[PDB]
Swiss-Prot record, chains A, B:
SUPFAM superfamilies: Concanavalin A-like lectins/glucanases. GO terms for cellular component: collagen-containing extracellular matrix; cytosol. Interacts with CEL. It comes from Homo sapiens (Human). GO terms for biological process: regulation of activated T cell proliferation; regulation of T cell anergy; regulation of T cell cytokine production; T cell apoptotic process. Residues 5-137 form the Galectin domain. The modification N-acetylserine is found at S1. Keywords: Acetylation, Cytoplasm, Lectin. Regulates immune responses through the recognition of cell-surface glycans. Essential for the anergy and suppressive function of CD25-positive regulatory T-cells (Treg). It is found in: Cytoplasm, Cytosol; Cytoplasmic granule. It comes from the Eukaryota. GO terms for molecular function: carbohydrate binding; identical protein binding. This is Galectin-10. Its main location: cytoplasm.
């Protein structure tokens, strides 16, 4: 719908930052659409990824980092707060020690920092969703 | 680019039919974009799938059917003729006993019929590609 997908925005993150995303899966859960959010160290898409978050709707969530070109230790969750056929609101907050992912207001996943959030230069949101809102907060010193 | 994605077209298939697709992945292979082609028994996206073909570019190909709502025996291939950053031409021919998948003119995958091709009513092409051509042949009795 409204925003282009794949969606790319330059971004800066530190403790207290929040990334808020509103969107809808492009297919029913039976067909297993995906959602992916990547926090990149450069504007180039092949750059390293401080935080990789990939939803297989209805099935599982996988999180990882890509450091010097190489995927690291994948963590997997079967927690699935997303609802079939529904619009979702996803917020990723940068806490001192981790990212916290809220889905529709509910804390759903966390991921300890492997690289300082200050290394992030770009956020990409892609795979099988439409996007109506993307926001990064910039109020903190 | 030119065609909408997810792309849905009503279709009829029998021995001698060919489905030809021309497109480009939306991301470099390092980021593992997907391509999926599904031959459905009805126009509804939740309908059964006579032939499910899913490319994880640079990694693997998975093929299956979905019968009465349930995924069946998955077959996996590591054959990867698709080239990083390149446009591809994919053709799926309906042979008497199987689907044959050509990639850029090269036979690359086959999949024995689990359900008669006559059950197909719809083809959907989706995931992380742009599409410039989709054609189904209709010349045979």
């Amino acid at each position: 719908s409204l925003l282009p997908v794949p969606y790319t925005e330059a971004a800066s993150l530190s403790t207290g930052s929040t990334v808020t995303i509103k969107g809808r899966p492009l297919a029913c859960f039976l067909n297993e659409p995906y959602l992916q959010v990547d926090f990149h160290t450069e504007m180039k898409e092949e750059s390293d990824i401080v935080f990789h978050f990939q939803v297989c709707f209805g099935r599982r969530v996988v999180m990882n980092s890509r450091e010097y070109g190489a995927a690291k230790q994948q963590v997997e969750s079967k927690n699935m707060p997303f609802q079939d056929g529904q619009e979702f609101e996803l917020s990723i907050s940068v806490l001192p020690d981790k990212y916290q992912v809220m889905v529709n207001g509910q804390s759903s996943y966390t991921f300890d920092h492997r690289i300082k959030p200050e290394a992030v230069k770009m956020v990409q949101v892609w795979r099988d969703i439409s996007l109506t809102k993307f926001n990064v907060s910039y109020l903190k010193r």
